[PDB]
Amino acid sequence: HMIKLSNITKVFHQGTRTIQALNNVSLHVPAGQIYGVIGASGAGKSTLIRCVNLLERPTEGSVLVDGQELTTLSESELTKARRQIGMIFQHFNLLSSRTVFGNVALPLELDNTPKDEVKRRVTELLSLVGLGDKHDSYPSNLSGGQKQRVAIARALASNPKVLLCDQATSALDPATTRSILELLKDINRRLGLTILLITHEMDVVKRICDCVAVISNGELIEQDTVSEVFSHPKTPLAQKFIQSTLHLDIPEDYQERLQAEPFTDCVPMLRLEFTGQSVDAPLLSETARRFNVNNNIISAQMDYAGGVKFGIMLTEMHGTQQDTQAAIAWLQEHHVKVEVLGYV
Amino acid sequence: MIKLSNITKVFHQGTRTIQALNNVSLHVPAGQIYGVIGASGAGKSTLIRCVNLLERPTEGSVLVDGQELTTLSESELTKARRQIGMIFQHFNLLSSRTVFGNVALPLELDNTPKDEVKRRVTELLSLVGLGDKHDSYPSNLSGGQKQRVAIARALASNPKVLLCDQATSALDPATTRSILELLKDINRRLGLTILLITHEMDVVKRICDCVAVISNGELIEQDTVSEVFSHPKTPLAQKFIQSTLHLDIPEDYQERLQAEPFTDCVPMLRLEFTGQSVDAPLLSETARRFNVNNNIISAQMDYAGGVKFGIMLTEMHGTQQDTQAAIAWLQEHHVKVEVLGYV
Amino acid sequence: MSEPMMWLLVRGVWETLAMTFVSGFFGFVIGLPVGVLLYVTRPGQIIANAKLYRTVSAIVNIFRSIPFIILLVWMIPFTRVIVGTSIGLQAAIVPLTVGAAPFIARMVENALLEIPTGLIEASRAMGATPMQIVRKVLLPEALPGLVNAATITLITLVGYSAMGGAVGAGGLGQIGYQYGYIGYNATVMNTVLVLLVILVYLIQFAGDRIVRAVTR
Amino acid sequence: MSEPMMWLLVRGVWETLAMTFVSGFFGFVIGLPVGVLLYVTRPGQIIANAKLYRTVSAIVNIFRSIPFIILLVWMIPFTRVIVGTSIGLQAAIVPLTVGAAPFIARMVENALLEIPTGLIEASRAMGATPMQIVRKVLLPEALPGLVNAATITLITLVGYSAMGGAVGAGGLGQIGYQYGYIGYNATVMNTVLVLLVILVYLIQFAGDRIVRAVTR
Ligand SMILES: Nc1ncnc2c1ncn2[C@@H]1O[C@H](COP(=O)(O)OP(=O)(O)O)[C@@H](O)[C@H]1O
Ligand SMILES: Nc1ncnc2c1ncn2[C@@H]1O[C@H](COP(=O)(O)OP(=O)(O)O)[C@@H](O)[C@H]1O
């Protein structure tokens, strides 16, 4: 009951036409947990995350952060509200004129904070983010990673209860994203900071998120624990993103040769999803012996998401139509979700 | 077509001696697509320019179509550049011109009949599927559609060479596929030599016959794409052959991984496949024959220059007599078995 | 060169410096608020009025559209009304500041447009009041732009106080007008001109040396 | 509102329009080549002369620096020699031309710096002569910037012409000086001023409307 966005809808009257950004979006982020909202470019990730802070006004709905209604509020009270919700962004939005020290200090000077308390507060957050070294530097000097730590430190300046991330590592590279995401996680785990997160990369969700919602055109299609979404994904669109966190490519020549209608001399290529219980079990070797079947494994990968192992396989199965149907049955029996992609 | 010989180039910027390229010599057979790959700052940008002499080599000699281009004059160097068409990363189109006229430009530079410039340009646009979009200006066009204009312009003069400077560096994988795919159908149809530089590897596999690998000034390999992908000579090439095969090795195993054998252990292996092998149901086959259990971790197969390729990591549960017999069998079948450690 | 002539140009150079800097100063005490309150009313901003903007923009465009000499001559009645005089140094510090303000506002608003908008968005996220973001974030980020606008401002105001010297503002503009147009003396005309180019190059050098002093 | 007054005043409008456009025209005949001469001669660029560029740019600088009044009057001895007259519009479009030429060449250079280097590299690879380059690629690409630059020159020459009223070039700007500066009539001052603001907007809109249609 940390943050509760209920029925959030935002619409635009930008030109001669009215475009709909979000539809009855409802999400609840438990206190001390990390919630990621994932979606394609244009789904309303940006608008949604902005409704929490009320940089954007939801046409209709309810924004309840830390228990307090935010939608209807006095402008002098929204400022009192933002001292609990810091924000970080894709592009870093750091002031080019001020040192990393002053940059972290900036939200504090917005309240009439004493100069003596400020310096103590700033150094700790600079020591926390790993920039305690670079006290006297300007954003033009810092690398992408450095700059993002500053922005996080700055958001953590007001010692906020909730942290929002607007594609925060969408600009940083793979090597750096992980350390920022790990730093961002540690702050949550070590300090209990509630984090809301939007991204378009599923790699991001699985690395640090505890719950996850998949959004497509303003509507939420799958909404559940990270573990349940990475194992037993109920949406085809949801599968697309998961199958991307692991790099599972079907070689160009297969999808061309592969056809959904069964033909003479054909064998089924099927993709298998393993949930935690079956991921480490050598079931494809067992399946080879028991039912006298030959599996041509095209590609396969396993990973962890939400503290739960999972994995996916792409394979064509050779054998008798009776044998094939039998081993598939043994896989479904052993918590491996079998799904036939067609025949080749 | 293209024979760069012992060419060396060093910049003069700010009392710094950048070995842009160091003792570089490259030969390309007429009508064959040849690629050059390297890390940023390696010298491929400087190099591809050395072909049509947009950059002058401080040492060495360049001959295209047999004729040397360094020993030239300014007006004779233009006449020679009519045979070396070039395309660019940033698509470099005149926003003031239309698609048609933009392609007519290279023909305009050297005075040509209006009807002939219509005829010529009309061919090349309908060839790239832009015989339709004649009237559009580049502000309107797509990333790929602009590159199709760039291509159509490079061939306006009807050249013998088509140079590509990171042509798809800032392009969509679907329209990267299509562009590389378009360049390939051109190689075959016209006998056009393609020499291209890139930092992307996906492109090397996709369209190259041969490939060089250049670094810190000097190009250190030069084999078939196929041969280089399977059996890389330089540690540099190993890195490039690593980016293509998406081989995510789990983080969890390292704390669990041992350098030497332990009681109740199963070894962990790295299997590398080649050609027809990649499609053989080999792990289902060893599973029966030697009554061992492969818990399969990771697998990716990839066409890399006209040869199929594959790699996988597995545990192998079973007896020590069953294991050495299956591992031996796999090796007898041309699967490269490398043990990594134990779990 | 006369001995009275030397002690005269010195007063000219003084009257010239006094006019450009004071007018520049007043043009900013006015233009800077006009420019900031022009930026904050643009569509999508903190206080976007498509109606208020069109007005404040329409007047500056009109004033800015009026050639200075004409603006000054037409302002002569107001000048005498407010100064009590039409002739002099402090008489000219009126049409020169009114001449300067329309230019300053456009530049200030344009300088503020260099600031990347997410910086505004970031400010609000922290809980910044609309007045705070101006003095805390906007002016500081556009400071090199503004310091640069001021240089370019002072310089147009050198050319401006000069035109004033043909209609009685004094300064080096007067000395070049009397002794270069009406009655001609060679040493007198040339030293006026060379004093004016040096004054511009000094005003440019000083402005740049301050812009180069801000951290990238 | 004397009809006869109106009939000249109508002359004045013609005197300004003539001065603005004819000086503008010659400003570009001097400006376009000095402008490309700098850009093309830039250090990154193909001609790559610092020694020649330094010279040309510094000449442009010391002229841009000279305030127009002090230039116009200083040029009189020279103005007279060329035309035979120091008075009248025809002598005046001479210092009006040298007023705008250096102002233009820097606009032209900057208008050419806007277009992506690499149109040159795309251009060179096709066998393009530098003469072919400038004419076939450089200029056409810079056209929106060239048209916008001419609008700026013309608006500036409107304001530059009226300053000629004081030295007696004689134009709509002069009607202002005589009636506003010497013998104050409120109908003719209001009428001269309003006519010039209208002339700026017509120059802005003619120019702005043509640029809108020259981007692609
Ligand atoms: N400031 C804005 N002005 C006009 N339309 C907008 C604005 N922001 C978003 N939209 C529209 O609303 C949709 C919401 O998506 P957006 O907020 O951009 O999130 P995402 O990061 O998923 O694209 C966008 O596809 C866009 O069409
Ligand atoms: N015109 C130039 N002047 C000075 N240095 C250059 C120039 N062009 C490239 N370089 C530098 O010298 C090296 C030449 O490599 P380059 O030709 O840019 O190949 P790549 O495309 O692999 O970067 C690079 O490190 C680059 O930064």
Ligand code: MET
């Ligand atoms: C790219 S790994 C190739 C392995 C083969 N498909 C098998 O079934 O064992």
Ligand code: MET
């Ligand atoms: C998520 S891939 C799981 C494959 C399984 N462990 C097998 O080898 O049979």
